[PDB]
Amino acid sequence: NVSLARQNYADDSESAINEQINVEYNVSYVYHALFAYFDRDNIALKGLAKFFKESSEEEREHAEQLIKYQNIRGGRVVLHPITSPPSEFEHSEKGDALYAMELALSLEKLTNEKLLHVHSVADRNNDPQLADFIESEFLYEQVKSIKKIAEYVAQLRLVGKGHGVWHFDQKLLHD
Amino acid sequence: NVSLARQNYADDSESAINEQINVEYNVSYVYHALFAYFDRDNIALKGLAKFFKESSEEEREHAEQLIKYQNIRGGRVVLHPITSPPSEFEHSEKGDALYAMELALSLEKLTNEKLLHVHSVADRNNDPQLADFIESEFLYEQVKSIKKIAEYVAQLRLVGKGHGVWHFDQKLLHD
Amino acid sequence: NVSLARQNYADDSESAINEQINVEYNVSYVYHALFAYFDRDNIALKGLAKFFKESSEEEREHAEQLIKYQNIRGGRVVLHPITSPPSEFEHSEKGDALYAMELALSLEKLTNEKLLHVHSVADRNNDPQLADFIESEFLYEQVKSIKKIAEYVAQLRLVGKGHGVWHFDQKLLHD
Amino acid sequence: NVSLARQNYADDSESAINEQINVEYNVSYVYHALFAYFDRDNIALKGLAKFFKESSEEEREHAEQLIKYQNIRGGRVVLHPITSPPSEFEHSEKGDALYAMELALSLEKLTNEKLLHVHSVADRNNDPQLADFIESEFLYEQVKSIKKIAEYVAQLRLVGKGHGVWHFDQKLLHD
Amino acid sequence: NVSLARQNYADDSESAINEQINVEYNVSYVYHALFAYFDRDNIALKGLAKFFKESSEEEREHAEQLIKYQNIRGGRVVLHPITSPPSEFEHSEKGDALYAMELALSLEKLTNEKLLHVHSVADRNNDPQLADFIESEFLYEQVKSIKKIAEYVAQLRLVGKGHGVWHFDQKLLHD
Amino acid sequence: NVSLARQNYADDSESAINEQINVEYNVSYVYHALFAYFDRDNIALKGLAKFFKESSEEEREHAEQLIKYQNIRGGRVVLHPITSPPSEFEHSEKGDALYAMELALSLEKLTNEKLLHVHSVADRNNDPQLADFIESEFLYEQVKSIKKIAEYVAQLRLVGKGHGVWHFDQKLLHD
Ligand SMILES: [Mg+2]
Ligand SMILES: [Mg+2]
Ligand SMILES: [Mg+2]
Ligand SMILES: [Mg+2]
Ligand SMILES: [Mg+2]
Ligand SMILES: [Mg+2]
Ligand SMILES: [Mg+2]
Ligand SMILES: [Mg+2]
Ligand SMILES: [Mg+2]
Ligand SMILES: [Mg+2]
Judged by DSSP in three states, A82 sits in strand
Q: Which of B53, B43, B126, B138 lies closest to B88 in space, CA to CA?
A: B43
Of E7, E129, E132, nearest to C109 by CB-CB distance is: E7
Q: Which helix (H) or strand (E) holds C96?
A: helix C96-124
Q: Can you list the pairs that C87-95 forms with residues at least 24 positions away whose Cβ atoms lie under 8 Å?
A: C87/C33, C87/C36, C87/C37, C87/D76, C87/D77, C87/D78, C87/D79, C88/C37, C89/C34, C89/C37, C89/C38, C90/D1, C95/C156, C95/C161, C95/C165
The dihedrals phi and psi of B82, each to the nearest 5 degrees, come to -110, 120
Q: Which chain F residues in 100-129 lie under 8 Å from chain E, judged by CB atoms?
A: none
Residues 6+ apart with CB under 8 A from F118: F16, F17, F19, F20, F130, F134
Q: Which helix (H) or strand (E) holds C145?
A: helix C140-159
Describe chain C by its helix, strand, coil percentages, rounded to 5.
Answer: 75, 0, 25
SS (H, E, C) chain A: CCCCCCCCCCHHHHHHHHHHHHHHHHHHHHHHHHHHHHCCCCCCCHHHHHHHHHHHHHHHHHHHHHHHHHHHHCCCCCCCCECCCCCCCCCCCCCHHHHHHHHHHHHHHHHHHHHHHHHHHHHHCCCHHHHHHHHHHHHHHHHHHHHHHHHHHHHHHHHCCCHHHHHHHHHHHHC
Judged by DSSP in three states, F39 sits in coil
CA distance F33 to F11: 33
CA distance C146 to C52: 14
Chain E contact present for F83, CB below 8 A: yes
Q: CA distances (Å), F111 to each of C135, E162, F20, F115, in order? A: 45, 43, 8, 6
The dihedrals phi and psi of F82, each to the nearest 5 degrees, come to -105, 120
Judged by DSSP in three states, B80 sits in coil
Q: CA distances (Å), B26 to each of B19, B63, B110, in order? A: 11, 10, 11
C-beta atoms of E39 and F64 within 8 A: no
Residue A25 corresponds to which amino acid? Y
Cβ–Cβ < 8 Å for E49, F12: no
Q: Which residues crowd ion ligand 10, with CB under 5 Å?
A: F 132, 135
The dihedrals phi and psi of D42, each to the nearest 5 degrees, come to -90, -5
Method of structure determination: X-ray
Cβ–Cβ < 8 Å for F90, E1: yes
Q: Which helix (H) or strand (E) holds A151?
A: helix A140-159
Query: Any idea what DSSP says for residue F82?
Result: B
Q: Which helix (H) or strand (E) holds D155?
A: helix D140-159
Q: Can you list the pairs that A151-158 forms with residues at least 24 positions away whose Cβ atoms lie under 8 Å?
A: A152/A101, A152/A104, A153/A98, A153/A101, A153/A102, A153/A105, A156/A95, A156/A97, A156/A98, A156/A101, A157/A98
E82, β-bridge pairs? F82
CA distance B77 to B19: 10
The dihedrals phi and psi of A82, each to the nearest 5 degrees, come to -105, 125
Chain B contact present for D42, CB below 8 A: yes
Cβ–Cβ < 8 Å for C75, C9: yes
Query: Any idea what DSSP says for residue C171?
Result: H
Residues 6+ apart with CB under 8 A from D1: C42, C90
The dihedrals phi and psi of A129, each to the nearest 5 degrees, come to -70, -45
Tell me which chain A residue has its CA closest to the CA of residue B61: A57
Chain D contact present for C58, CB below 8 A: no
CA distance C13 to C123: 10
Residue D33 corresponds to which amino acid? A
SS (H, E, C) D48-116: HHHHHHHHHHHHHHHHHHHHHHHHHHCCCCCCCCECCCCCCCCCCCCCHHHHHHHHHHHHHHHHHHHHH
Q: Helices D163-173 & D46-73, crossing angle to 10 degrees?
A: 50
CA B166 from chain centre, in angstroms, equals: 24
Helix segments in chain E, DSSP class H: 11-38, 46-73, 96-124, 128-134, 140-159, 163-173
Terminal-residue alpha carbon distance, chain E: 48
CA distance B74 to F93: 59
Q: Which of B64, B69, E174 lies closest to A170 in space, CA to CA?
A: E174
Terminal-residue alpha carbon distance, chain A: 49
Residues 6+ apart with CB under 8 A from F4: E41, E42, F74
Of C113, C134, C147, nearest to E5 by CB-CB distance is: C147
Task: Provide the sign of the torsion angle of the four alpha carbons B90, B94, B97, B102, taken in this order.
Answer: negative
Q: Which helix (H) or strand (E) holds A156?
A: helix A140-159
Write the burial class of residue B41 (CB in 10 Å: 0-12 exposed, 13-18 middle, 19+ buried): middle
Q: Which of F45, F57, F82 to mutate to test the interface with E (most CBs of E within 10 A)?
A: F82
Domains and CATH numbers, chain F: 1-175 (1.20.1260.10)
Query: Would you say A142 is a known binding-site residue?
Result: yes
∠ CA D108-D111-D113, nearest 5°, is 110
Q: What residues of D are in contact with residue B104 (Cβ under 8 Å)?
A: none
Give the distance (Å) from ligand 10 centre to CA of residue F129: 9
Q: Which of F101, F87, F103 lies closest to F32 in space, CA to CA?
A: F87
Q: Subunits with at least 3 CB pairs below 8 A relative to chain B?
A: A, C, D, E
Q: Which ligand is nearest to the CA of B132?
A: 5
Query: Would you say B24 is a known binding-site residue?
Result: yes
Of D40, D78, D81, nearest to C81 by CB-CB distance is: D81
Cβ–Cβ < 8 Å for B16, B117: yes
Tell me which chain D residue has its CA closest to the CA of residue C50: D68
F82, β-bridge pairs? E82
Cβ–Cβ < 8 Å for C131, E128: yes
CA distance E10 to E20: 15
- Count other C-beta atoms under 10 Å from residue B10's C-beta: 16
Tell me which chain B residue has its CA closest to the CA of residue A75: B40
Q: Which of F170, F169, F175, F21 lies closest to F100 in space, CA to CA?
A: F169
Query: Would you say D80 is a known binding-site residue?
Result: no
C-beta atoms of E67 and F32 within 8 A: yes
CA distance D35 to D52: 5
Q: Which of D8, B53, D139 lies closest to A60 in space, CA to CA?
A: B53
∠ CA B127-B130-B135, nearest 5°, is 125
Residues 6+ apart with CB under 8 A from F154: none
Q: What is the resolution of this structure in A?
A: 2.1
Chain E contact present for A81, CB below 8 A: no
Cβ–Cβ < 8 Å for E150, E106: no
Residues 6+ apart with CB under 8 A from D87: C76, C77, C78, C79, D33, D36, D37
Cβ–Cβ < 8 Å for A74, B36: no
CA distance A65 to A21: 9
C-beta atoms of A41 and B77 within 8 A: no
Q: Which ligand is nearest to the CA of F25?
A: 9
Helix segments in B39-173, DSSP class H: 46-73, 96-124, 128-134, 140-159, 163-173
Give the distance (Å) from ligand 5 centre to CA of residue C78: 27
Give the distance (Å) from ligand 1 centre to CA of residue A124: 22
- Count other C-beta atoms under 10 Å from residue E124's C-beta: 12
Residue E128 corresponds to which amino acid? P
Query: Any idea what DSSP says for residue F85?
Result: P
Cβ–Cβ < 8 Å for F157, C159: no
